[PDB]
Amino acid sequence: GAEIKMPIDFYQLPGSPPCRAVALTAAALDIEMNFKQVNLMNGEHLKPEFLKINPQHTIPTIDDNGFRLWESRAIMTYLADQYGKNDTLYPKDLKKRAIVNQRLYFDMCSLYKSFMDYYYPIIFMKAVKDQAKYENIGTALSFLDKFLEGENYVAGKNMTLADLSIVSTVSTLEALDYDLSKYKNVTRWFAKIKPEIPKYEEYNNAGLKMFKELV
Ligand SMILES: N[C@@H](CCC(=O)N[C@@H](CS)C(=O)NCC(=O)O)C(=O)O
Numbered sequence: 752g753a754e755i756k757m758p759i760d761f762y763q764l765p766g767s768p769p770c771r772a773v774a775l776t777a778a779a780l781d782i783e784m785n786f787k788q789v790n791l792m793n794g795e796h797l798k799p800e801f802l803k804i805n806p807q808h809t810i811p812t813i814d815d816n817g818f819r820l821w822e823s824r825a826i827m828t829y830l831a832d833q834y835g836k837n838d839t840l841y842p843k844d845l846k847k848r849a850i851v852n853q854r855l856y857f858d859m860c861s862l863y864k865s866f867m868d869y870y871y872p873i874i875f876m877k878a879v880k881d882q883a884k885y886e887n888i889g890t891a892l893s894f895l896d897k898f899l900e901g902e903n904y905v906a907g908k909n910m911t912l913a914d915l916s917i918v919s920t921v922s923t924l925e926a927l928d929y930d931l932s933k934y935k936n937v938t939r940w941f942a943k944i945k946p947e948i949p950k951y952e953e954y955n956n957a958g959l960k961m962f963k964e965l966v
Pocket residue numbers: 767768769791796807808809810811821822823824
C-alpha cells in the first residue's frame with residue numbers, strides 16, 4: 752500500500768518438511784521469494800531480530816511487505832489466493848476447497864504428526880525407538896492410501912496444495928528409508944506427482960539432501 756513492493760522474505764531451513772511445502776507452493780505459483788536461511792542448529796530463530804518477526808520462533812515464516820505469517824499450511828493457502836494464476840491449485844468452489852483444507856489438516860494432524868513423533872526423538876534426542884509411534888505412521892499412510900484409491904491426486908481431479916503438502920511429508924519418509932511399498936496407491940501417486948511439481952528437484956530433493964546430511 753503506497754509502498755514499493757519487495758520480494759516476500761521466506762525464513763526457512765532447506766531440509767525442513769514444512770518449509771519445503773511452502774517452497775513448492777511458491778514454485779507452483781511462479782513466485783520468486785527471498786530465501787533467508789534461519790539456522791535452527793545454532794539458535795538463529797531465538798535471536799531478538801527473529802523474535803520480532805515471529806514471537807513463536809518457528810519456521811517457515813514469511814514477511815510479505817510487512818505482513819508476517821507463520822504456520823506452513825496457512826502460508827500455502829494465503830499465497831495461493833493472493834498470487835494464484837489458475838483456479839486448480841486451491842479451488843474457489845467451496846466443496847472442492849473444503850476437501851483440500853481437510854487434507855491439509857490430515858497432513859498436519861495425522862501424517863506429518865506421526866512422522867515427527869517417531870523420527871525426531873530418535874534422531875535429535877537419542878530416544879529409544881517406540882514401536883507404537885512407528886505404527887502410527889502406517890495407520891496414517893493407510894488412510895492416505897484409501898484417499899488415493901481410484902484417484903490421481905489427493906484432493907480432487909487436479910494437483911492442489913494438498914499434494915504439495917503431503918509430498919513434502921512422504922518424500923521425507925522415503926529419505927529416511929521408510930518402506931512405502933505396501934501402500935500401492937501412495938507409491939503410484941508419489942511416482943506420478945514428482946515430474947509434475949515445478950522445481951521439485953531444486954526445492955524439495957536438494958533440501959532433503961541437507962536433511963539426510965544432518966541425520
Ligand atoms: N505447525 C508448524 C510447525 C513449524 C515447526 O515446527 N517448525 C520447526 C522447524 S521444522 C521450528 O521452527 N522449530 C523451532 C522452534 O519451535 O523453536 C508449521 O506447519 O509451520
